[PDB]
């Protein structure tokens with residue numbers, strides 16, 4: 226029993242982290258096969274960040290201007306190209322620790338593990354969720370760019386995030402591994418702010434199922450509700466609408482615990498209207514929305530990875 | 532910026548996890564050099580758990596009765612011995628991925644990362660703390676025994692925990708890597724319950740410093756207090772006494788933020804007496820006590836590991 230914010234094992238991703246240095250700027254890079262992926266603002270000075278012309282700055286750079294270090298070994302760069310907001314540095318050595326991997330673009334509300342790195346070395350791992358406003362609540366400092374977010378399916382590492390910058394209130398924004406930003410953000414040091422965030426409703430319900438699986442059941446009421454009636458209440462308290470797709474994904478947890486999704490919705494409706502009255506669910510005094518239905522099943526049934 | 536429950540990178544520990552099978556019981560084992568460490572109740576049937584005579588059960592077993600699998604490769608066992616509540620299985624092959632490591636016994640209040648494993652394969656990683664009642668609030672299922680807790684100092688992995696069993700209310704107990712249980716618990720399926728837990732005061736103060744570093748400063752009051760006056764208030768609300776040693780460890784965070792430890796104690800005294808009045812600190816509606824002063828410095832300054 227027990228329920229904790231569990232991150233994926235980071236070993237496969239650790240064997241891919243390298244250090245990329247251009248001029249005096251240093252950040253992290255991802256070494257898969259014979260290509261290194263890193264944020265494109267490695268070619269920027271501190272003054273270049275206010276208004277960078279990345280196409281102009283990359284012109285003036287050659288292969289030998291990129292210092293790539295994998296541990297105590299320098300990787301010779303033999304080619305470079307820019308795909309949206311990431312650089313692709315072709316090196317003469319393929320990474321022998323390259324795992325089976327994919328490049329995926331996740332949806333808002335989906336979770337992944339972040340391996341925070343500095344100078345190409347891992348500092349820690351934590352679980353995050355793509356917020357509906359296309360930010361993440363992470364923990365990044367200077368030089369953390371290049372750290373990646375990933376999911377693991379059996380032996381395959383699905384890379385879905387690369388850190389680029391921090392937004393006001395201490396939230397973070399980045400791109401997929403193709404350089405495309407999550408949200409309407411740009412890699413430029415200018416005034417940018419995230420949109421108003423909302424609560425991931427399908428993740429709250431899955432976290433309530435995890436509580437019932439663990440015997441924390443005080444919040445279960447005796448009622449049911451209609452998907453429409455629940456969504457009207459959810460709209461008031463800044464909760465995302467619960468679609469029929471979300472109901473289908475919650476099927477396994479509903480069948481395991483014997484509680485219909487609409488019955489758990491009626492229980493959530495009361496919590497939104499009355500609060501928790503000084504009680505906790507799974508030790509938390511607030512409703513949690515960074516566990517997907519798959520995170521609950523994977524943790525409560527002990528799914529392992531090759 | 533940002534502050535999250537960060538776990539250590541698990542890569543070094545993943546290369547040490549093996550699967551140990553004896554009869555029909557299967558659990559996890561730690562493979563360091565040419566020795567496999569696993570909980571001793573692997574030699575137990577389900578009926579042997581109510582009253583096991585481990586010395587008697589191990590007599591009846593030989594080296595070939597232990598099936599050790601590292602991936603798809605079986606490790607030949609050439610010797611075995613029991614040290615308190617763990618088995619030491621000597622194998623004919625040294626683990627080539629053995630990291631620089633130590634066996635340490637941590638104190639209550641100190642933190643570490645747990646790599647939850649099943650059948651020798653990692654399922655996830657999370658950060659925990661040794662509670663003052665010598666339990667941990669983890670997430671373990673059937674077959675999770677053998678999963679280890681560890682700290683990483685540069686390139687050295689300090690193993691400090693091995694999971695053995697779950698206690699009422701869903702808390703967990705285990706041993707150090709020498710087989711010695713944390714707390715007055717025994718590896719027997721009989722009525723056992725943890726003592727009443729308390730809040731790790733030095734970890735709460737360090738987590739308040741992390742909030743001030745991150746700009747969350749509404750709780751800072753204008754007062755100071757004496758170590759004695761604070762400890763009387765802390766004793767009322769089931770908080771551990773703050774020793775002078777704890778004050779010295781909080782030195783770096785106090786010098787970084789310019790807030791004396793006794794001033795932060797006066798701020799904590801008001802929070803304990805008035806509550807938080809519907810406000811959050813670092814997004815949490817409750818005071819957090821599973822971040823050591825070192826976890827705060829390591830996260831807020833980005834300490835990496837080799």
Ligand SMILES: *C(=N)[C@H](C[C@@H]1CCNC1=O)NC(=O)[C@@H]1[C@@H]2[C@H](CN1C(=O)[C@@H](NC(=O)C(F)(F)F)C(C)(C)C)C2(C)C
Nearest residue numbers: 266365366368369370389390391392412413414415417
């Ligand atoms: C990469 N190493 C850093 C990681 C940052 C540093 C502090 N916390 C993080 O996550 N990324 C940057 O420094 C990026 C980058 C220039 C500036 N930047 C920012 O994150 C800035 N934010 C913004 O400008 C805003 F608000 F628009 F998002 C900063 C003010 C330093 C937080 C470039 C090239 C955009």
Ligand SMILES: *C(=N)[C@H](C[C@@H]1CCNC1=O)NC(=O)[C@@H]1[C@@H]2[C@H](CN1C(=O)[C@@H](NC(=O)C(F)(F)F)C(C)(C)C)C2(C)C
Nearest residue numbers: 572671672674675676695696697698718719720721723
């Ligand atoms: C190792 N694979 C399991 C992990 C357990 C299983 C459920 N959650 C966990 O952490 N360890 C055990 O099954 C141990 C073990 C026998 C029984 N046991 C227990 O954890 C039991 N707890 C107790 O008996 C109590 F309350 F005294 F701690 C159980 C009732 C199954 C939770 C042995 C040899 C002690």
